[PDB]
Homo-oligomer: A and B are copies of this chain.
Amino acid sequence: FRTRDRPLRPGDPYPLGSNWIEDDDGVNFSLFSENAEKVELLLYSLTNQKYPKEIIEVKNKTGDIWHVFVPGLRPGQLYAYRVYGPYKPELGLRFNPNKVLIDPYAKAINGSVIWNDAVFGYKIGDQNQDLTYDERDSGEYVPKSVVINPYFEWDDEDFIKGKKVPLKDTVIYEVHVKGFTKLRLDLPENIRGTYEGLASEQMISYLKDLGITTVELMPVFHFIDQRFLTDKGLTNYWGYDPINFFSPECRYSSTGCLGGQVLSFKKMVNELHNAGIEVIIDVVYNHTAEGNHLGPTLSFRGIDNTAYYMLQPDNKRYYLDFTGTGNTLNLSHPRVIQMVLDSLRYWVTEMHVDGFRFDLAAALARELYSVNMLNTFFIALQQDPILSQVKLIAEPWDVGQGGYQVGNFPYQWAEWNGKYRDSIRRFWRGEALPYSEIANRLLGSPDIYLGNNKTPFASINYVTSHDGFTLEDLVSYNQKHNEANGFNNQDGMNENYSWNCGAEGPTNDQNVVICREKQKRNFMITLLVSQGTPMILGGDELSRTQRGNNNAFCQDNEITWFDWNLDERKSKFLEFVKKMIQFYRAHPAFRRERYFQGKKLFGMPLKDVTFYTLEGREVDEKTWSSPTQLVIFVLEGSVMDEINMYGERIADDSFLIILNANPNNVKVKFPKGKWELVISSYLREIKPEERIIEGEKELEIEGRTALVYRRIEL
């Protein structure tokens, strides 16, 4: 028989990908290819996945989209594609139907890659490398896509689609799905380090106790372990290397990789929303795990290489790399643009995601070679009805030339404030930066984001992230220790703006431990007292340590697992971060929607913020540009231009904050009021000269100490 003797329907080229049509009993397959000449649908049995149990040729094509509707099939059916066409790598055409490809619209993938020189489309050994054409079948080594059933019952989950957590009052908590619960011997295994483990009653209660509002999850897009990681006994722990944009990772799931990864994800989000916790997901759209040339041929390169990938225009054999990871997705092609926003819309309307943190966000604005934030993809995202409502967070740079684009992302976009990261670490490190540099950071960095009409909550303040040290390692090391990575300690940035407190590594010396505990609390008070929306690094409340590894993308082991066993030193830091989060959330003078001016307002005798120096005298224009290790400012809570959504003014307590990074002691004369101690970084018992201050008193402030005060009388 031929392809015409098994019953078929022409199908439709609408909803790209496999779509279970319950009413007609069958499945509709759709796949874009501008350049394919023949497209063949492969169907596998669950048992036999080395050869296809049936080969169907996609003969119908409406426009640049191939499609066929195969009767009898149900959800759960395994499938993959073969794309026939021209092979001219020096021109960009790398079509090899011997290599089995993965549906870019597959919403569930069964397993991952079995590395073998057959999944490459070019002779691995040959001297002419990626110009050659290896004819080995790779079907038995590449995972297959699953037709999923999209249906799901969201128990009173649609009511949180109303009054959400506004970014004004948000506290971000960056988590790795696996590390959150792998060493949670509390839970059973089989859910440890899984989606279900994250949404268990034990973790949900913990997250409300900690007090964070929303969770930001490291890449959950179904990703592949790199071969140069496999050939060193290593894994992709972070997962910033995906090949599919619609499948939740099968490695994070704990119910089944045959569609159970999308079920256990939806059930996970449903559990969090029933606890009033928003969900943001780290998302890679700038590059794909297929690498540059010499990389594998597992999907896009096979389906249509000159559409999906940015290729060097004069050769078109090599790949433009603005991510440092081999390739860069070509976001200038209409269907590539359609893919990303289809995926962005998919995770919102179907997986009920509340926001996205874009990895290397600038690389998405690359048109040929230059970054212009007025590209097609950003505009369409801005105008879209549903994507206009969820939060959009950017890593405001890529590793290209001219890629540093902080403050140039459109409004509605928030940005990771790297300038806040670096200068705050240097301030407490000991360096003396201008009074105007750190004071700007503390008031939401208006110098950055005001020029493009943005707000203080648009600035994402953070002192540590998954890139670089953790907070414990930040006060415990001065140099990288990525020796365990297997790259001869050449990977991961060298300047971390780090300081050890008096060692490098673990220590017994009792001054080194304390300088840190004081330094850890010094960072914590700074972050949650500055204007903007703060991001906590996951595990930092637990004083998590990566053994001095500032680049633990490859370590899926005890280095990156969360250590839940707490001693007395760790337990009391947890209560500190708890009470500091509880503080920041209780006081609107730090959850501000508009910036502080330097003025009295509403006809009041105090100006909304005042800056002092060692003596209670106001900061001048020449003190404001001189360097400093001590910065003093008074937030007048009752004279803020802060108005809620109902037209009411807000106002808060009046606060005075002392940040003295000078290693030596300094004496400070207070302003005119009677001030009360609310929190400080002192580990020692707070003696009563310091608890209440009256009438322009002077007070000894030990070196490297942060203090918060509240005026009780004027």
Interface residues of A (CB under 8 A from B): 22-25, 72-74, 156, 159, 163, 205, 208, 211, 275-276
Contacts and interface: CB of A to CB of B under 8 A. Distances in A.
State the majority secondary structure of interface residues on A. loop
Contacts of A24: 163
Nearest to A201: B76
B74 A208 contact: yes
B159 A23 contact: yes
Contacts of A211: 72
A219 to B, nearest CB: 28
Contacts of A208: 72-74
A22 B156 contact: yes
Given A25-B276, A72-B211, 12 more contacts: A22-B156, A22-B159, A23-B159, A23-B163, A24-B163, A25-B275, A72-B208, A72-B276, A73-B208, A74-B205, A74-B208, A74-B275
Contacts of A205: 74
Nearest to A273: B25
By CB atoms of chain B within 10 A, which of A23, A24, A159 has the most? Answer: A23
Contacts of A276: 25, 72
14 contacts: A22-B156, A22-B159, A23-B159, A23-B163, A24-B163, A25-B275, A25-B276, A72-B208, A72-B211, A72-B276, A73-B208, A74-B205, A74-B208, A74-B275
Contacts of A25: 275-276
A163 B211 CA distance: 51
A273 B208 CA distance: 39
Nearest to A7: B211
Q: Which 9 A-B pairs have the closest CB atoms?
A: A25-B276, A72-B208, A23-B159, A74-B275, A72-B211, A74-B208, A22-B156, A23-B163, A22-B159
A46 to B, nearest CB: 8
Nearest to A277: B25
A28 to B, nearest CB: 15
Contacts of A74: 205, 208, 275
A154 to B, nearest CB: 14
A212 to B, nearest CB: 10
Nearest to A26: B276
* Residue from A23, A24, A25, A208 having most chain B Cβ neighbours under 10 A: A25
Contacts of A156: 22
